[PDB]
């Protein structure tokens, strides 16, 4: 199976410069199409670029001529996307995707769209620093309980940039999982919660721990959630 | 709307037979090196990702192709040399004293014979040394040569070596050689890692039975490949992973005689020996071959069973060149009792000396009508070779028999170049294709 | 040489660019001159010569193969497509040919005017 | 199939070329050399061909056309009677005569053309 790796999240101020790589597993490097696709918060998808590493020449949309520039390494099969002078408006996550192609001979080339994706990187062009989450319990107890289920979770405050991943017993507990967005706070840094829904009877039986992590600030902590002691 | 697109050079090929030449690094040599084109010094050779092919070691038409190369070899080689027709008279035999050792007794043979003079006249008395291989006595006493009475002898001519050298067997243009690159692969089946060449390793032509020697050795772990594993009837191909020293020497100081039998016509005799005469044997270490055993019992379990008793004991019947260990160690031709290399059972420093016997009138290609004389070799003689597989033969054990035995087998030369030809298959090219598309000729 | 065997057609599609031994090295060098000269024989015979990749003037007939075009240039190989159109194989052959005499007799038409 | 438009006319048999083109490259004992002198003696006849065809600007073309007027010396015959009350056996046997210096004609005149233009 066809598999591509991005880069992780980046934090950038405002008139640098930003570089993605990608790379591919499972394919001939040099005859495979590559796209670059960036989503802003809340929008659409947006092609920026796309490229085969044997013809060489890539190709852009009009809008980002002169500040995107897409290269290519095929001894380590890897694909980077670097763009400059960048504004405020161009925080996105960003996602390298992959597609065949075939040739009828004569500079024709006829392609067959995206059809293998990565995960993407999450780009924030802002000003503020970096800042560490800080993870709180909200314990299960008499007011968290219904009809024999008990909701008990996780608070991640005061953190930047996105995003954090938070998840329960290292990826066991996914069922009644609840991870809500984030909401920008005034202070400028996110917040956001992360709960589950339990029988009430493994409470005293069962362990439950969140893991959190903000690859950002390299922040990993696990926090274990009991219910508040009287 | 489409229409048809022709592609020249797509990756498409079929199986196919044809014929390979010949190629050898860069002048008495009985295959011809000499007239074989030279090797390029580094070879080009391309994996294939992703592609899965079918390999068969047991209906390869390159051995065939070899077999037949040898042979016409052969047979061209044996052309100029000098006829032996006056040889076959009634000799006058005597056994050979002075300085033999109790395991020489009767070896050689003193023989005195009347010879036709370079006159067509007047006859000569002669005398030579034979074994006694070569003689058959007839009712001193009176002997005649082996082969009077099935075959012509014709006498090797001296200045032509048999040193085998490498061959490189090569494909023309619009044919490949696919090799299978797996290490593990058992000969018959798919191989999922292939690449394709357009000559073989070198390969060189040694003719030996019950051991293969100077070979290739296994990568990984000792290989055990049959065409039927549980017929009886086909033999056991047992490929080394680490090779075994054999040490042979003949160690006897002979003499070489000319005898004129007609104008222009000479024949070599052997004069007398100088010194003691000895008897010729080859040596192999007990603990490496005592390893070598474990590892191949250890390998041969898996096709019988966790718990079956295997053990090996030696040949049983036939003519001499398949119940010993032949072979030829230069210019001289051995055949060797290895009844103490297959000795043993095996349950769920020193040496080990194989005495040999010398034979000069060789039946070669299990062939009938045309013997061949070897000349006699001047000095002692002494050679080193390595040991890198065996050929096996399993007995019909029935009536509930927990117990397999296998025995040294071999005499067909075809089993002896399968050994080397065994990852290779020929391919023919088919770049020409047509595909739908849909742009149109202008 | 070779090295597309185990990919798609359309990623194979861009890169398509006397004595015993002497009697034998004689045969391989007829053998081989053969070859390449029929090879582009029937290359020239259908107006394609000079070229690796040449469209034609015929119609694909949807009785030779009715899939789409998606899964013949990014799910198969040439080596699996081999194995489907091999008994067509003459026929489109000899369309080929009268399609170029065709065009051949209508460019003499076109010049005698 | 193969020469079968012998009897039919020059115009008729002028749409059969690539049926007689193909059948030309393919179509140590008593037998062992009678079969590879064969194959020799094909493929020079051929290269031979096709060098005399690419020798006159006509390389890789079944019908080509020529800038060497028909001098009406060689025949007078109207095109109403060649094309369709002829045939290429018959054909053949009158202008037999007069080949070579066609051949030489169209060298010449091909040679020219490529010497001024590539001036
Ligand atoms: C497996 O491989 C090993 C290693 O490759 C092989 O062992 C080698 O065997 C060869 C052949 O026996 C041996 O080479 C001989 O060694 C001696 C010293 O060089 C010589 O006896 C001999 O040269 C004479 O014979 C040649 C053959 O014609 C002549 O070209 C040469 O001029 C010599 O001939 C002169 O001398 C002889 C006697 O002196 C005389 O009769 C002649 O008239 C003439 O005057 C060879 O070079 C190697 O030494 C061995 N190598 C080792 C390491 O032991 C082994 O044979 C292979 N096994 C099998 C089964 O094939
Ligand atoms: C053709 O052969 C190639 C080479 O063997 C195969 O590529 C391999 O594909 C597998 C998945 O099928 C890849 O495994 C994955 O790799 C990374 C790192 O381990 C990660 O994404 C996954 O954990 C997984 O292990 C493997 O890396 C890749 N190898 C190479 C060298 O690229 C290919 O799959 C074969 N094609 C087909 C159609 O089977
Ligand atoms: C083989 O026999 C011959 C005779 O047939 C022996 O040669 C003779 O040996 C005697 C005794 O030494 C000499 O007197 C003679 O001159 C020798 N020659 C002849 C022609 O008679 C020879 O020694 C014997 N060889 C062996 C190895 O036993
Ligand atoms: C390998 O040989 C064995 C015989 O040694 C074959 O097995 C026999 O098959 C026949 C039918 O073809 C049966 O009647 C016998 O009873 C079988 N013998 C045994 C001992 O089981 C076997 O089929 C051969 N394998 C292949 C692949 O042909
Ligand atoms: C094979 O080994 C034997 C036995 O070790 C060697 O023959 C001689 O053996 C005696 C004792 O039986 C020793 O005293 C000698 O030293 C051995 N000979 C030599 C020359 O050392 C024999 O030499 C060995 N074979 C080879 C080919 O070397
Ligand atoms: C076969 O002969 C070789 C030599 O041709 C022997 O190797 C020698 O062994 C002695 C005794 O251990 C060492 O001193 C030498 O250094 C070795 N020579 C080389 C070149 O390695 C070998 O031992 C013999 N093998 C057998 C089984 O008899
Ligand atoms: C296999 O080994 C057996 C047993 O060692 C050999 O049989 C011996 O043959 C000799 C004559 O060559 C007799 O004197 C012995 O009495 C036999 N032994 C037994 C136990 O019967 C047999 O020759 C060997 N087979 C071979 C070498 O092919
Ligand atoms: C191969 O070797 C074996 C074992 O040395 C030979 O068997 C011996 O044969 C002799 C007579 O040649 C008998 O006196 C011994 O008793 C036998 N030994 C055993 C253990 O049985 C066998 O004959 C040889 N093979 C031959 C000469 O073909
Ligand atoms: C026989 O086996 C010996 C021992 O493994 C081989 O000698 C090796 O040769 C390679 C290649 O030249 C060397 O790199 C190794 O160092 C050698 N090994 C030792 C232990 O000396 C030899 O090549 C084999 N083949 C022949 C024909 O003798
Ligand atoms: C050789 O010939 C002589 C006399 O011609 C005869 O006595 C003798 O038996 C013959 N054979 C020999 C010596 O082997
Ligand atoms: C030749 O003689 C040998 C030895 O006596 C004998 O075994 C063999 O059968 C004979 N061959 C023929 C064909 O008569
Ligand atoms: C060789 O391996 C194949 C599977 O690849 C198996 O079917 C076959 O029986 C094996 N042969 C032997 C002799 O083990
Ligand atoms: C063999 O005999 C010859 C001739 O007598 C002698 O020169 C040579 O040294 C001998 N070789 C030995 C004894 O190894
Ligand atoms: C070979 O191994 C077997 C099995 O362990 C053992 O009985 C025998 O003595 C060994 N031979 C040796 C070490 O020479
Ligand atoms: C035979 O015994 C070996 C000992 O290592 C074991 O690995 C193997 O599985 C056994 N074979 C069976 C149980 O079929
Ligand atoms: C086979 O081995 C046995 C047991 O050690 C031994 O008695 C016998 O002599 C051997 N046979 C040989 C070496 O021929
Ligand atoms: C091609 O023809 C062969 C031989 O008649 C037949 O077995 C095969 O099914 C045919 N294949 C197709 C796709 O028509
Ligand atoms: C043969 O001549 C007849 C009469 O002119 C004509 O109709 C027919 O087409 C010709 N056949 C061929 C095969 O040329």
């Given at each position: 199976e066809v598999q591509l790796v991005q880069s992780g999240a980046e934090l950038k101020k405002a008139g640098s410069s930003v570089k993605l790589s990608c790379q591919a597993y499972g394919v001939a490097f040099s005859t495979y199409s590559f796209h670059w696709v960036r989503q802003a918060p809340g929008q659409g998808l947006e092609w920026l670029g796309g490229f085969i590493p044997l013809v060489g020449k890539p190709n852009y949309t009009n809008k980002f001529r002169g500040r995107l520039t897409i290269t290519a390494d095929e001894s380590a099969r890897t694909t980077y996307m670097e763009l400059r002078s960048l504004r405020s408006d161009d925080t996105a996550i960003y996602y390298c995707a992959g597609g065949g192609a075939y040739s009828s001979g004569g500079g024709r080339f006829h392609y067959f769209g995206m059809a293998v994706w990565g995960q993407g990187s999450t780009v924030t062009v802002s000003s503020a620093s970096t800042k560490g989450p800080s993870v709180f319990p909200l314990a299960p107890s008499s007011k968290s309980t219904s009809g024999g289920t008990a909701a008990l979770g996780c608070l991640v405050k005061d953190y930047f940039p996105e995003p954090?991943?938070?998840?329960?017993?290292?990826?066991?507990?996914?069922?009644?999982?609840?991870?809500?967005?984030?909401?920008?706070?005034?202070?400028?840094?996110?917040?956001?919660?992360?709960?589950?829904?339990?029988?009430?009877?493994?409470?005293?039986?069962?362990?439950?721990?969140?893991?959190?992590?903000?690859?950002?600030?390299?922040?990993?902590?696990?926090?274990?959630?009991?219910?508040?002691?009287? | 709307?489409?229409?048809?697109?022709?592609?020249?050079?797509?990756?498409?090929?079929?199986?196919?037979?044809?014929?390979?030449?010949?190629?050898?690094?860069?002048?008495?040599?009985?295959?011809?090196?000499?007239?074989?084109?030279?090797?390029?010094?580094?070879?080009?050779?391309?994996?294939?990702?992703?592609?899965?092919?079918?390999?068969?070691?047991?209906?390869?038409?390159?051995?065939?192709?070899?077999?037949?190369?040898?042979?016409?070899?052969?047979?061209?080689s044996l052309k100029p040399c000098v006829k032996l027709t006056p040889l076959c008279v009634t000799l006058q035999c005597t056994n050979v004293?002075?300085?033999?050792?109790?395991?020489?007794?009767?070896?050689?043979?003193?023989?005195?014979?009347?010879?036709?003079?370079?006159?067509?006249?007047?006859?000569?008395?002669?005398?030579?040394?034979?074994?006694?291989?070569?003689?058959?006595?007839?009712?001193?006493?009176?002997?005649?040569?082996?082969?009077?009475?099935?075959?012509?002898?014709?006498?090797?001519?001296?200045?032509?070596?048999?040193?085998?050298?490498?061959?490189?067997?090569?494909?023309?243009?619009?044919?490949?050689?696919?090799?299978?690159?797996?290490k593990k692969f058992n000969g018959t089946g798919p191989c999922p890692s292939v690449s394709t060449v357009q000559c073989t390793h070198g390969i060189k032509p040694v003719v030996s039975t019950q051991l293969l020697l100077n070979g290739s050795l296994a990568?990984?772990?000792?290989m055990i490949r049959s065409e039927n594993i549980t017929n009886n009837a086909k033999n056991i191909l047992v490929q080394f992973n680490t090779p075994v020293q054999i040490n042979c020497t003949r160690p006897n100081n002979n003499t070489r005689k000319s005898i004129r039998i007609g104008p222009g016509q000479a024949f070599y005799a052997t004069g007398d020996i100088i010194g003691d005469i000895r008897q010729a044997h080859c040596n192999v270490s007990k603990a490496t071959w005592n390893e070598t055993l474990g590892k191949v019992v250890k390998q041969?379990?898996?096709?019988?069973?966790?718990?079956?008793?295997?053990?090996?004991?030696?040949?049983?019947?036939?003519?001499?060149?398949?119940?010993?260990?032949?072979?030829?160690?230069?210019?001289?031709?051995?055949?060797?009792?290895?009844?103490?290399?297959?000795?043993?059972?095996?349950?769920?420093?020193?040496?080990?000396?194989?005495?040999?016997?010398?034979?000069?009138?060789?039946?070669?290609?299990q062939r009938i009508g045309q013997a061949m004389y070897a000349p006699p070799i001047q000095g002692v003689i002494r050679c080193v070779s390595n040991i890198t597989g065996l050929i096996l033969t399993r007995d019909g054990g029935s009536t509930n028999s927990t117990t397999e035995t296998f025995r040294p087998g071999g005499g067909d030369m075809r089993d002896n170049w399968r050994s080397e030809l065994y990852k290779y298959k020929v391919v023919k090219i088919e770049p020409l294709g047509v595909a739908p598309t849909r742009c149109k000729r202008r | 040489f070779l090295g597309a065997a185990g990919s798609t057609m359309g990623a194979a599609s861009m890169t398509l660019t006397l004595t015993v031994w002497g009697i034998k090295q004689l045969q391989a060098r007829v053998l081989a001159v053969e070859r390449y000269l029929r090879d582009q024989q029937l290359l020239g015979i259908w107006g394609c010569s000079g070229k690796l990749i040449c469209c034609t003037n015929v119609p694909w007939n949807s009785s030779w193969s009715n899939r789409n075009l998606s899964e013949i240039w990014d799910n198969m190989t040439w080596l699996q497509w081999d194995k489907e159109i091999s008994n067509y194989t003459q026929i489109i052959y000899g369309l080929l040919e009268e399609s170029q005499n065709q065009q051949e007799k209508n460019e003499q038409d076109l010049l005698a005017l």
């Open positions: 954090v991943t938070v998840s329960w017993n290292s990826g066991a507990l996914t069922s009644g999982v609840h991870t809500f967005p984030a909401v920008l706070q005034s202070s400028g840094l996110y917040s956001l919660s992360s709960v589950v829904t339990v029988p009430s009877s493994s409470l005293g039986t069962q362990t439950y721990i969140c893991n959190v992590n903000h690859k950002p600030s390299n922040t990993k902590v696990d926090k274990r959630v009991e219910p508040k002691s009287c | 709307n489409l229409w048809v697109t022709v592609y020249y050079g797509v990756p498409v090929w079929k199986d196919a037979e044809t014929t390979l030449f010949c190629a050898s690094d860069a002048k008495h040599n009985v295959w011809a090196t000499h007239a074989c084109v030279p090797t390029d010094p580094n070879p080009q050779e391309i994996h294939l990702e992703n592609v899965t092919e079918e390999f068969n070691m047991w209906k390869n038409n390159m051995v065939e192709q070899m077999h037949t190369d040898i042979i016409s070899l052969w047979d061209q004293t002075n300085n033999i050792t109790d395991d020489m007794r009767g070896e050689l043979k003193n023989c005195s014979f009347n010879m036709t003079t370079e006159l067509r006249d007047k006859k000569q008395k002669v005398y030579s040394l034979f074994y006694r291989l070569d003689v058959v006595q007839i009712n001193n006493k009176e002997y005649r040569l082996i082969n009077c009475n099935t075959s012509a002898i014709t006498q090797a001519c001296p200045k032509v070596s048999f040193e085998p050298i490498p061959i490189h067997y090569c494909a023309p243009a619009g044919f490949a050689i696919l090799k299978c690159k797996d990568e990984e772990e000792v041969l379990r898996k096709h019988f069973g966790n718990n079956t008793i295997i053990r090996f004991a030696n040949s049983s019947g036939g003519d001499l060149e398949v119940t010993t260990h032949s072979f030829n160690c230069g210019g001289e031709f051995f055949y060797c009792n290895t009844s103490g290399l297959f000795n043993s059972t095996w349950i769920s420093n020193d040496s080990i000396t194989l005495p040999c016997r010398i034979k000069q009138i060789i039946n070669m290609w | -």
